[PDB]
Amino acid sequence: XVAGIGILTX
Amino acid sequence: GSHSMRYFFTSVSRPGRGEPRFIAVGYVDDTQFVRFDSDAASQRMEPRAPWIEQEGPEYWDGETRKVKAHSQTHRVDLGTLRGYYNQSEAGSHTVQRMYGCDVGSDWRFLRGYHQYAYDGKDYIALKEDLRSWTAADMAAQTTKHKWEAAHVAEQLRAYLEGTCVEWLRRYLENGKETLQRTDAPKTHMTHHAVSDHEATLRCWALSFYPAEITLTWQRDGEDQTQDTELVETRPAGDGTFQKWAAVVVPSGQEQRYTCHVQHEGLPKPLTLRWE
């Protein structure tokens, strides 16, 4: 259940 | 009881020696169920618990796609943060991200988490309200602004309150025999002379699940916290946990000491005595 949204570069 | 799902991501740079290594692991409560390792041959998310092997190719392809995207983001981060902190290109640095959700005994949402660390120290974290950010310093404020502009918190809130909770429930159902169990501690005590006037009393808890436990010694009903050697709760390697607590007892005083064990699998806490 890997997030598929919200995971952005710093 | 309550439950949690967590994903943990570590990326470590190795300048001159190719791309950073990236390792992802996923847990439900204290049971690991997936991994990804950038250095491994498969280049796929892989099962690490039997209950998740029943997932089909749609599942595994999707998790592989996502974890690869996470790997790329974190690789870029190593470079960006190296720049933000004005660090040389020669040294190894680390980035870590953890996110997930907790639910109560009713399996309803209790809280969400998303946090990020650089070289082992807090960098940026989503606050409990899942709407705002804590930034560790001036570099981190810059990231905060980027993530505010891109509405990251709203996305993460939707995941943490929604997807994460739905899936935690799904996993709890699908892996019921492993995940919905409690294994109460098997306990015992050992006694070893250290001299002619002292002995160690060691109270053991073995083969328990979940890992949360409390082990304490008392002397005549008074807690002996400052005089107890308490080890960290440790994995047995078989999905259960172990812990012990020891006290040094002047000889002839064994009857004064009691060991107290609290665990979800114990309807009533235990009181053990050497006698």
């Binding site: - | 943990f8 570590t10 470590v12 390792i23 692991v25 847990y27 690991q32 991994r35 390792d37 690490r48 190894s92 640095h93 680390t94 870590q96 953890m98 660390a117 070289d119 082992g120 120290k121 807090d122 050992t190 070893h192 060691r202 073995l206 080890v231 960290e232 440790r234 994995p235 047995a236 390697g237 078989d238 172990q242 012990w244």
Partner: protein, 100 residues
């Protein structure tokens, strides 16, 4: 940068009974950075067939790993864990004691 020393526990999966199959564990925890060397020893010699858990970390960001191998304890064979890490001036050897 942050450097945290590993905690080290060496222990068996099951209560040790001489002549019965078991697993020897070395649990390293509370360390940073993640680069670490952990060997299990039988009578001072490095055991070759040692697996380890996937790298994970605690709420405080510190790493933990379980290193493990099959073994069958006896009265006389000696086991230990040997750990090296940037925080250690020399490798730390912890002997296995069946009641720890």
């Amino acid at each position: 940068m942050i450097q945290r020393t590993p905690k080290i526990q060496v222990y068996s999966r099951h209560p040790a009974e001489n002549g019965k199959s078991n697993f020897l564990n070395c649990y390293v925890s509370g360390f940073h950075p993640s680069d670490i060397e952990v060997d299990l020893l039988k009578n001072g010699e490095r055991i070759e067939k040692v697996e380890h858990s996937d790298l994970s970390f605690s709420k405080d960001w510190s790493f933990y790993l379980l290193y493990y191998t099959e073994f069958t304890p006896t009265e006389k064979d000696e086991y230990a864990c040997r750990v090296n890490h940037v925080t250690l001036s020399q490798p730390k050897i912890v002997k296995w004691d069946r009641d720890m």
